[PDB]
Amino acid sequence: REKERQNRLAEERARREEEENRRKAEDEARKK
Numbered sequence: 001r002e003k004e005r006q007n008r009l010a011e012e013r014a015r016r017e018e019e020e021n022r023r024k025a026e027d028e029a030r031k032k
Helices: 002-031
Strands: none
C-alpha cells in the first residue's frame, strides 16, 4: 500500500512537472 501511494504521488509530481515544462515551452514559443 505504501509503494502504491508513493508511486501514485510520484506520477502526480512528474505529470505536474511535464505540465510546467510544456507550459514554459509554449511561453517561449509565444516569445518567438
